[PDB]
Amino acid sequence: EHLSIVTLEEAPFVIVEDVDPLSGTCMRNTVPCRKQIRPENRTEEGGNYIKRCCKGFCIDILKKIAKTVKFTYDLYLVTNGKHGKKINGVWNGMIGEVVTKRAYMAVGSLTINEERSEVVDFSVPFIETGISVMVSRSNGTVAFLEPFSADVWVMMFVMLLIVSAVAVFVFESFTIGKAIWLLWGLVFNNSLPVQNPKGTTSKIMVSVWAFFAVIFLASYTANLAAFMIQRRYVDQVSGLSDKKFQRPNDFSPAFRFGTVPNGSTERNIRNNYLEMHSYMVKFNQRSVQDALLSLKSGKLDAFIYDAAVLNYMAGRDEGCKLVTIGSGKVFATTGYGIAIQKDSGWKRQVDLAILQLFGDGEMEELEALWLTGICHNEKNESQLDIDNMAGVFYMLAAAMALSLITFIMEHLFYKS
Amino acid sequence: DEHLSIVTLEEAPFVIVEDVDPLSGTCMRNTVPCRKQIRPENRTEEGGNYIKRCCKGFCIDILKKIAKTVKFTYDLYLVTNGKHGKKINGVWNGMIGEVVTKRAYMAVGSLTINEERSEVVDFSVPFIETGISVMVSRSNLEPFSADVWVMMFVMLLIVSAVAVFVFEYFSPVGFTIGKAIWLLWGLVFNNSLPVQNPIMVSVWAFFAVIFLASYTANLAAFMIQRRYVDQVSGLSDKKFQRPNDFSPAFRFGTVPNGSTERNIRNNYLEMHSYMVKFNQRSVQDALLSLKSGKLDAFIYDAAVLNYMAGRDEGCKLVTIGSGKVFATTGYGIAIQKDSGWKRQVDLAILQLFGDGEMEELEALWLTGICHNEKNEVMSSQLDIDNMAGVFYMLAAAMALSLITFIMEH
Amino acid sequence: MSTRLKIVTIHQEPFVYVRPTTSDGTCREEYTINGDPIKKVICNGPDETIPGRPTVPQCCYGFCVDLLIKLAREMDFTYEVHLVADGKFGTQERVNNSNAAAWNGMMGELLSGQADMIVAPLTINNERAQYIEFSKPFKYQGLTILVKKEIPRSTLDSFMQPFQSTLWLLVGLSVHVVAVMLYLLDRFSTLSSAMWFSWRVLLNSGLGEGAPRSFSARILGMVWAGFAMIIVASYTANLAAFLVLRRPEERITGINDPRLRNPSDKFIYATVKQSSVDIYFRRQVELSTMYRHMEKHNYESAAEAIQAVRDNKLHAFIWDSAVLEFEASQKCDLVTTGELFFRSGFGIGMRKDSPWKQEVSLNILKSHENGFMEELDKTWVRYQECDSRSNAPATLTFENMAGVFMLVAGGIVAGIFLIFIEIA
Amino acid sequence: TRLKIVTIHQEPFVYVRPTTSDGTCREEYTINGDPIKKVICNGPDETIPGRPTVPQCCYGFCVDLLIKLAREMDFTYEVHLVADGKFGTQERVNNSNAAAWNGMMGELLSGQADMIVAPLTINNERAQYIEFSKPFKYQGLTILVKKEPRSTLDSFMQPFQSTLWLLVGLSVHVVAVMLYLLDRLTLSSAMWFSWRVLLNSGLGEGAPRSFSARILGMVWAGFAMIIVASYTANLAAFLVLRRPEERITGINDPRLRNPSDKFIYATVKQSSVDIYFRRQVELSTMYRHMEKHNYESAAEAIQAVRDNKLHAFIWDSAVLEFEASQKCDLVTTGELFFRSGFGIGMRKDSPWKQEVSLNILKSHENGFMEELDKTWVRYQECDSRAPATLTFENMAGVFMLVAGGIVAGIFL
């Protein structure tokens, strides 16, 4: 039961790797899969077909299904690139090859729409996918010094000095220097080892400074709790707020939405919003990586794309600047499915195989091994980060090395 | 230079009625004289003698100004019949009833402009916005969590065992463990310990940073509760449309034969039938019903409620919905129908709007000591009951500590 | 029964939207935020995209168009709506004639016969009322000043904003009741040493010179130290509690703010030229100073001044309250600052000798009592207001800190005078 | 012609309430401002213990989808509630050689019904007997529970991560050692100075007079006010809008795997969620705890989870998240697992399956399911909080950290 299957290449659903030239054959997960090039060639103007090894998620589904229903397979790739678009009544791509009978089954990154469901049949959904938009947010947030203002330094130091200068003389075995270290120590939440004054008048002014201590302390406690109690939020409007699919302008100078021309998402946006069809056809992209670079280099505000492929990408992003608008919003709600022959086919038993892969929990194990991303794998990652402590320690350590500069300057002035 | 008799009602702060100054035997300050024909009885008359009083207010001032810009004489008269306007058996009674009855050529006061009224009488431009509004007084000291006293005493016992575990230097008595329990306990209560300890004091200091951080952080927790949120916000909420729902029922009512009664009757028949049984008497009495729990919420005119909340002592009763106003109608001087100074009075009102003198008028009358607060709702400006509870703990533990002093004596 | 009457309107954004026509000539079918069909009419107005000022049809929709249709239902009349030629509201002026003045704008065309009724957010005022008759207003509004959302300043107040004057007297009464009580409780029944003991325990001064050791005075001093950590915890607690739910200081504290009266060239404000506010500041002589500044900085369109407020080009923009509040509910970069003034009302305009004024004003009163205008408010004041905005106080503001610092410095200086008081 | 429609009472999708005294369904309008569409359902009124059939008024998401599908194809319908009140299962009660189905499945196989328009989940065990369309609801499995308290641990290391606290100590020895070096018994004076400055012990033991050492100690005391202001800052921030607890087990959690009688997690009896833990032999142990503590109706489990009777409740993500958005006393488990989909069910030989399923594929393409979502899954917000009295357990936690440090100090 040699069953030839046609597929397209889109990671991580179908990873294509050249055969190991030392082993000749394919190693580990990968199953043999050919690929033929019309434009250039070695012999017979293209007659030679290159050999490759195909491994991945959907490829593991096709090989595992091939082990469960006992149907053998010689995998084959598509020459004309497409997903499920049909032009002038003629379909091309994976669903096009499914309608052209060149493949009994078609497993890959093929979306299930009504136009394909009318001419070919599909199986049970494997992964939930639809139309979605992706945009990047800058990690521009910025720290404990932020609480107190710049008036803290000039005002506080000035008042201290003036008060120890004035207050010391309102204060008027041994006498040890000036008690300004006692005042500044009192400002930093008591913890003052200095000896207080023995006079009667100094018992008043110091008390006043104590006020100026605690209040300042309170400010250093209030305002450090003020700027730090404003985080973890997003206020971009939901529910098609940009209206760019119908009215491209918005509260922003421009909204750019690109679709893959002659694709399922473009045809679905072409049949949904005709304004999105005109502006999407004018802003039609080449590949997915070009649109991703357009979203990373500020060349595109957003993109309109398959949802699952963008959902696995969140893990992929490093420093996770990128994210999926809506915290996981899905618009179309359709699913992936292996194509079968119309009307007639093994469809029922194959569907039993798919839902059996779901019943054994292989979708959870595959999502944990493949889908799961170091990023967001942890539940959500309230706790003071290292950035704030870096902000404080930059000033504490800066005052430490600057204190050593006060020691070297104290030596330059001490040698005189 | 015309008669233009005016009928009015008494409604603060718009028309305040004060007795004549006996020493002045005349209307004090900038008051205008206003009489009242007491018809049913008199010392020696039967509907012919009228008592004298002195009316002054916001509407009185606007009447004086309009009368200055438009040359006409007038003598202020109170309304004997009903009050305001109301229509019974197709016969008009009240201020509008006396204006259409030709018993008064003009009617200036806290009178609303409504369609049914504008059928029989004319109205000028509106000078103050006034509609229906809702107002409710929300019917609904540290987080010790049964641990302040028990953890302070157990912290004193751990201070005693730790004091015996220190074993350093030289101490006065064989007391000193209680001096390190008052020094360690005091240090647990945010430093302030003058006893130089000989570490156990370092452990109690860690308990001061962590435990004190919990006391201040949770003290900021219980106070971070956003308040002033109205119990019923929309006035289209279910609490108003269906009263027999939440137990106990939300008692609310209004004042009869006003604008709100006729518009509420012509708008909702069922809600009118439900609210007619719980109708209140006076405005101040309805404020008491909104304060004494006899009425959860209260709804009535907007402007009079705006001042009544602005001058309300303590600013307890506030408008539901942060100042939401339905209906949208407005007041105006009621002139004679069909004919009258229809355009000249309006022109006077609009030129008086051009000079901008209202702002000063509202500053003199409308602005209260409640709208003069900071631009923030401020939550609770200062603890008067919560701080008095902590003072009741310090004074109660001060008399009880005095009982431990006499018992110690 | 027809009585086809021309109708003139202006482009004020909430009330009258004016957008272009679709390739077929019809209006783009749009859905009301509530989930309903949006209304639509055609307007013969000035083309703002072309030099010629040519008349081009457009699709106009919003509050004033919907109210226009409701009135076209309640009364049996027909209409043809178009935007005004000069593009501005009504005002009186004399450009070429030194002895005769005339109206220009909607007011003009209404008097010129080019229109028979104007329905827009027309301000109601004395100058216009002498030539045109207004209805009982369909919109009750005023004037607010718009500003860009600048650095979040702090709500100015003295250092005692957390505790009123009534509670502090009781707190101090307890302070001297426990310091004098500490003077009586010490040694089981010195005074200055006792005040220094209780105060040193309340302020954590820790001098240690005087300190009662009695278990009644040390346990009462432990309830005193706990009252110090709890009282200080309450002070920092509420002091941090005002921090949220704070109203950032409004830039202009009303029309009579320090920067508002004095026309300093650092803060530039203006309003729409040939508009109601121009008659307001042009008639009022006292505001002439302000008017002077505005005389040189006013704009032709109101939107231009809006974007000027957004583009940091223009500092403040005094205008109608409904338009500015709506733009504040649309753009988060704009706020309206300070107390309202000149509270007027948009009402339908028509010539004084028109009997439509009576039934039309009455039907406006009905549409108020019918609750219809509220529905129009939910539809065209979407109130997609930017909310949950959080105050960010400046780490500190010299003011609100110069009050406490001024009290402490004042305490010192006076305290030298008090040292001179102890000298005598 | 006329075909029968079977449905079950599911809270968000199929409301089943009786009519007024007249007999017609009460006309109402949703919060959106739209007339709620209702139809007639002839099923067992649970109000009467009798299990007697009585026609009623039914309305919801699946009702709107049923009217929509009745509009797509040129057919009429006759809706009726399921007789037994359960979803359906396969069993052989009285015949040891012949098996049958019960529930809506039984009425469908016995011919009593022609179509099921309820939140019916697609799976392989049911796919052997009926044919399903493209799913109309994307959902999964989440453990639903009603969760209680601010502190589960000592509050000194909660606001500042381990790197921040360890950094604070590293600065303690950087200022103690840098103060011993800049000011050049003595080591104990440096450690006692830095520690006494960070903890406000106030010993007054010693002090250096060098400007380098005084500036170092001033940076250490100010930095101490900033680190105690950060610990009290972020420690006070976790007072409102605190992060949820781990009671939400997720796909791979210990609470979902271990069957303890104190943390009652269970599934609805005579439903699929019982088969999820009954088939797997590994969960057989848990199955034991599920065999003796299972509930019949999902609403009873919802009330048990609201009345603090059932700790967790594993159920579909659509219904559990809906009840979490309606009754905020309950929350679903993170890491959504067992993602399935509700779809309509038909018989094999029916031709409708070709068109109707395609219609569903078209029904998603036009965005009608998005409007149905805007109508029938609306999240009612709740009290954003607050904790109030709930501070004892933490305070015992931090006090346990201090007392534990006193024990380890006694060992030293």
Ligand SMILES: CC(C)CCC[C@@H](C)[C@H]1CC[C@H]2[C@@H]3CC=C4C[C@@H](OC(=O)CCC(=O)O)CC[C@]4(C)[C@H]3CC[C@]12C
């Ligand atoms: C669906 C078709 C057949 C129209 C139904 C025709 C009748 C069955 C009519 C006659 C009087 C109507 C009713 C008139 C009173 C109410 C209004 C409304 O009920 C309420 O307003 C709630 C307050 C209350 O229950 O009194 C909706 C149902 C009902 C009973 C109406 C329902 C239908 C009724 C009974």
Ligand SMILES: C[C@]12N[C@H](Cc3ccccc31)c1ccccc12
């Ligand atoms: C001095 C202080 N000690 C405890 C906790 C704390 C936290 C951060 C800074 C300061 C303080 C306290 C409670 C109330 C006021 C001030 C403080």
Ligand SMILES: CC(=O)N[C@@H]1[C@@H](O)[C@H](O)[C@@H](CO)O[C@H]1O
């Ligand atoms: C993925 C992609 O860009 N595919 C395009 C297709 O959309 C287009 O219709 C065709 C016309 O030449 O060229 C292909 O390369």
Ligand SMILES: CC(=O)N[C@@H]1[C@@H](O)[C@H](O)[C@@H](CO)O[C@H]1O
């Ligand atoms: C406070 C009160 O009930 N006043 C009513 C008044 O509204 C009514 O108009 C009048 C008779 O019509 O009877 C009075 O008692």
Ligand SMILES: CC(=O)N[C@@H]1[C@@H](O)[C@H](O)[C@@H](CO)O[C@H]1O
């Ligand atoms: C319901 C309603 O207010 N209808 C009004 C009526 O009150 C008014 O008297 C009349 C003008 O004569 O115009 C109708 O439209």
Ligand SMILES: N[C@@H](CCC(=O)O)C(=O)O
């Ligand atoms: N003056 C109002 C009374 C009700 C109100 O003040 O709104 C009237 O004429 O009916």
Ligand SMILES: N[C@@H](CCC(=O)O)C(=O)O
């Ligand atoms: N009568 C008030 C109304 C305030 C308001 O609009 O809410 C005033 O004119 O000042």
Ligand SMILES: N[C@@H](CCC(=O)O)C(=O)O
């Ligand atoms: N911004 C909307 C306003 C109308 C509405 O959605 O209600 C528009 O221009 O269509």
